[PDB]
Design a protein around this ligand. Structure first.
Ligand SMILES: Nc1ncnc2c1ncn2[C@@H]1O[C@H](COP(=O)(O)OP(=O)(O)O)[C@@H](O)[C@H]1O
Ligand SMILES: Nc1ncnc2c1ncn2[C@@H]1O[C@H](COP(=O)(O)OP(=O)(O)O)[C@@H](O)[C@H]1O
Ligand SMILES: Nc1ncnc2c1ncn2[C@@H]1O[C@H](COP(=O)(O)OP(=O)(O)O)[C@@H](O)[C@H]1O
Ligand SMILES: [Mg+2]
Ligand SMILES: [Mg+2]
Ligand SMILES: [Mg+2]
Lengths: 25, 372, 7, 372, 372, 7, 7
């Protein structure tokens, strides 16, 4: 520990799949 | 009741354990030490070669040799010793009763996998085995199915982009530049102060100096002026014999070779450009998800300041409207093993083993069809 | 390696 | 209790709903997505094919194909999956409980509606069905009974004149130029700026830029001179990667291909001359009312400024004594389905459904007799 | 006396010469080398500049950069040097006394040829100039006037059909898979043997290995089987240092990508399917003659046994009654330039020249008016 | 290129 | 289509 950074996000976090306007209608 | 063994065997450090655990059972440097003196106190535990930790505790009188350089096993007699020590002395389990999930770097010669399988089936006589790409297990462990893994082990640094579980093998990049090159570059730049480390038993002292003191500067051209103006950046280290060294500027010039490989006399681009190019090799649609799910792994990425600098680089490189998030957990020193233990425990995996019957039918050439 | 780089 | 199912089944995009509503229940692109890579994380959502919206969001790792090409169903094994996804997923209603109103483009090959009916009965086991002309429904939905409909969807363009509700088959005009031909011409003309879209995943981005920035011009030469005089027509569009492309002159060069098919290497005349010849093919007495109820419909006619341009062209082609009215409904994207629903809700139409027992008498060829 | 120079300037290799000759006078690999090490000795030659064979010779200490990439000039500060070298150092003639006929692939950024004309008229002060498509030159180099030119350089591949001297722009096809992509794929697949090439210098070694020992198969699967079964299909190459390497299965796997781009992950169609599609986009009354007069050209179609493979493919795709003949002249490596010199010796092309004052009166855009 | 592909 | 045009 102490090797985590200010701009580091734990693997526990999860984003959502990409959705661009080219994908709706 | 049989449980698979997850045995990493990457360059620099070998980590073995049972399938279904949260941490490797046994971690030890993957070295083999040959005694370079002729000792006559016979009967006191003399041997012909010391493997793993037993070599480090004796490295003073040994020549330490790594059987795996840049991800490739250059010596198979030594690798058989490493695996035997892993099976019978660290895990203390017969290999002929459990399946073995080994890992390999991408873009290695096919002879590596061929001989891995031949050894695991003809010498240790395992009932089943598998060979997995490390940067895929590093995503398994992160609890994801979409992201670009940036795995930087001791001897090799590779990037693999995956989206929704479908890997893009036309964008897998590899860079033979890792801890072992940073440690050999620190051994060179340390001479500017007057410190001369040359023995293979002092490469370990230099690797310890590097993994205890060195950090990655957020701005190299500014931290150079900082370390030039004042002595508020020096740190002292105590060798195992009493002498004390002090290193102020080398601290961030050691890992700076990752981002400017020209320091080592290499044409290749840094790790940030290696990741950016591997992102821009994919399709226009999935680049946004690859940007915001940039995973890190391997020991070489355990530098204080690596995530900040990587983000500052890949943000000045990516379009101004893309959000970059460097997924770097503190448990990334062993993400590949956790991914292996996750994969080996799954039920849908129990059909993906290479069974001993299969190997008896087609020889070692089978590992190319089954293993991705 | 055999050609290029050592390993 | 039961209500008929109205499925537009148009080329490129599919619409569906229940008979007797003022809006289609579900609209989804007619795209069949198949993975072109090999997954490495098995058990995390592996499906042999993705259809509809799931084939739009995941287009980064899919090859996408259209079951209908120029109004003709080219892959029936894919049309079956599209129909199955329409029935069992978007509407979540069984086919054996409702009549189904398919729609077809005029002058389409003989086996098209035959196989449509065959699949409707032998696979889905629908009670009743019909195959209506895609164009005539638009005049129904428009709230009129005389006039010529200009239906330009994604795969086929056609002008059909109808008087008092009876269609004039002798004056039907068809043109293979469509919205997907404009997408392809944009994929060509965009290269002059320095952009390259060639992948089926990127054809979708090209289609999105088209229906967002391109617009028909009223005087093509004057707008060309405007663009060449001062750059005030350029617009910035952001791809899913975050690049900022900039199309200027290329705004109206794409829709202009409707009026001059010579840009696409085609010999036929534009849509305005097509409508003019179709009208002048109609009986002289009724022409007086035709020129007053020229209605645009379908997707591709939703271009900014297409109304004024069509009016100018057709009034410069037709005599000055005639009254030219280009009536453009502000919801013409679904007019075909609205008219299909209106027609299906009629008690008089409750006898025009080709029934199953009737299908058993003369085989699929029965569709050629009942449908006009 | 006074003649017209001809500077092909294709990707990879720049060709140049005088009109009338049957071979380009000066041909050299169009690269620019830059020293990546700091010189220390006095007496050493030029810095920041190494062009052509001079750069090829000393590539052991340089980083190489191709100013052209996929047919688009990426860095003009280097292309200007390339032109300066081919004018003053290879042809050894002042460029202010000769017209110059440059070449450009179809479907390229307009600003490319705009800057080409601007540099030709603003730096070297040529009296006149002209830019032509390479395909039109290739067909004009075969003496034919009715054929489909299949050209394939190092960065572009294009099929262009021409009938009775009239060019059909609607059917011009350009695939981006070309020679350098094959070189990269070879660099990637050679790692299986264990041969690592990652430097831009060793890319030249790989390219030479490719064009010396690689051959495209007639039946890919059969060749794969024979290679996997026996060793009678393994060749040996000698690296510059003196080492000898062996290439077997890779020999035909490398060029096979031209027919199956999926090997590179590029989800597109092969070059034979590209030819078939560019033919099927032409009028139905001329497809047979195009089927009869397919001509090849460029340094990427000299692989042994490529004509027969393309003929087999097209015959499999084309109708049975249509006869297929692959005209493969054994001088195609320079054919386009030959075409260039030819187009420069016609009294009919001595008026199509873009005059200096013609450039002054209207600016660089005149290239689009005069040149097609 | 500027958009699509590198060049 | 089968003849003339693709579909
Ligand atoms: N905390 C750290 N800080 C800096 N460098 C490190 C750190 N941990 C490991 N390294 C470097 O990375 C290597 C260890 O990485 P490791 O994950 O053990 O490789 P592998 O998984 O291939 O065995 C060592 O060679 C060391 O130089
Ligand atoms: N404003 C617009 N500009 C250009 N094209 C459009 C516009 N609106 C719709 N389209 C195009 O028209 C087609 C949609 O027509 P539609 O009525 O759905 O017929 P289909 O069901 O055969 O696609 C698509 O190609 C779509 O991109
Ligand atoms: N006989 C050959 N077989 C295979 N490849 C070749 C041969 N000769 C040249 N090449 C390859 O063609 C590429 C470029 O040559 P060429 O296509 O003639 O340049 P240009 O595109 O300017 O015509 C080089 O990478 C070279 O290796
Ligand atoms: Mg590792
Ligand atoms: Mg429609
Ligand atoms: Mg060329």
């Amino acid at each position: 520990q102490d090797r985590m950074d200010r701009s580091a996000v734990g693997h526990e976090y999860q984003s959502k799949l990409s959705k661009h306007c080219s994908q709706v209608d | 009741d049989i449980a698979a063994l997850v045995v990493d065997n990457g360059s620099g450090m070998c980590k073995a354990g049972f399938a279904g655990d949260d941490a490797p059972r046994a971690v030890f440097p993957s070295i083999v030490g040959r005694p370079r003196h002729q000792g006559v106190m016979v009967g006191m535990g003399q041997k012909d070669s010391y493997v793993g930790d037993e070599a480090q505790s004796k490295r003073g009188i040994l020549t330490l040799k790594y059987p795996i350089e840049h991800g490739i096993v250059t010596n198979w007699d030594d690798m058989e010793k490493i695996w035997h020590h892993t099976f019978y002395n660290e895990l203390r389990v017969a290999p002929e009763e459990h399946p073995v999930l080994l890992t390999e770097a991408p873009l290695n010669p096919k002879a590596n996998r061929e001989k891995m399988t031949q050894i695991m089936f003809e010498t240790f006589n395992t009932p089943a085995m598998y060979v997995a790409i490390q940067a895929v297990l590093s995503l398994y462990a992160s609890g994801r199915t979409t992201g670009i893994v940036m795995d930087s082990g001791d001897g090799v640094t590779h990037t693999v982009p995956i989206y929704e579980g479908y890997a893009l093998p036309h964008a897998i990049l590899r860079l033979d530049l890792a801890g072992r090159d940073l440690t050999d570059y620190l051994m060179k730049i340390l001479t500017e102060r007057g410190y001369s480390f040359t023995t293979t038993a002092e490469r370990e002292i230099v690797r310890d100096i590097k993994e205890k003191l060195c950090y990655v500067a957020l701005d190299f051209e500014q931290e150079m002026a900082t370390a030039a103006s004042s002595s508020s950046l020096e740190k002292s280290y105590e060798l195992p014999d009493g002498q004390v060294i002090t290193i102020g500027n080398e601290r961030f010039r050691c890992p700076e070779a990752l981002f400017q490989p020209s320091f080592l006399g290499m044409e290749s681009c840094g790790i940030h450009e290696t990741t950016f190019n591997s992102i821009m090799k994919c399709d226009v649609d999935i680049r946004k998800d690859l940007y915001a799910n940039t995973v890190l792994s391997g020991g070489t990425t355990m530098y204080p300041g690596i995530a900040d600098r990587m983000q500052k680089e890949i943000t000045a490189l990516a379009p101004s409207t893309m959000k970059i998030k460097i997924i770097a957990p503190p448990e990334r020193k062993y993400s590949v093993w956790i991914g292996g233990s996750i994969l080996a425990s799954l039920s849908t995996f129990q059909q993906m083993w290479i069974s001993k019957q299969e190997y008896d039918e087609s020889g070692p050439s089978i590992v190319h069809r089954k293993c991705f | 390696w055999x050609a290029x780089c050592p390993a």
